[PDB]
From a paper:
The PIN (PilT N-terminus) domain is a small domain with ~ 130 amino acid residues and is widely distributed in all three kingdoms of life. Utp24 is the endonuclease proposed to cleave the A1 and A2 sites. Depletion of Utp24, aka Fcf1 (Faf1 copurifying factor 1), inhibits cleavage at sites A0, A1 and A2 in yeast, whereas mutations of the active site of Utp24 specifically block cleavage at sites A1 and A2, but not at site A0. This suggests that Utp24 plays both a structural and catalytic role in 90S.
In this study, we determined a crystal structure of the PIN domain of Utp24 from Schizosaccharomyces pombe. Although the full-length protein of spUtp24 was used in crystallization, the crystal structure contains only the PIN domain (residues 60–192).
Numbering used by the authors: 60 to 192
The structure:
Amino acid sequence: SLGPPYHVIIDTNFINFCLQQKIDLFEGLMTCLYAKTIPCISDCVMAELEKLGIRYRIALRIAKDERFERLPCTHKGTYADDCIVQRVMQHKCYLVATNDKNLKQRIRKIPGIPILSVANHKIRVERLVDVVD
Ligand SMILES: [Ca+2]
Ligand SMILES: [Zn+2]
């Protein structure tokens, strides 16, 4: 029910993991999912990219590409991990792309939210179905 127009919420560091592994975000997500995939970026994830500066410069530009869908934040100017977790609790129409061990263990509590991570020169499906309370 997630689609085969797939919506993938990007966390703050995911693009950087992609750049480190010589992965093009867009092709990598498309290849991982075998269908049109839409990378998504919340307002406050986008603000961190503005804020953290030099080593997120190339991430910032990539995040401003046409193919990104921007997700407005209906919350106070806050917390990138909490932002994703709150969004995928309301709307189960999302995947989460993160290599962050703590965010993943929070997402694994939420049924139905697949996790993608960068590994071995590809984006892989890290969490397919299983819940860990
Ligand atoms: Ca969309
Ligand atoms: Zn937010």
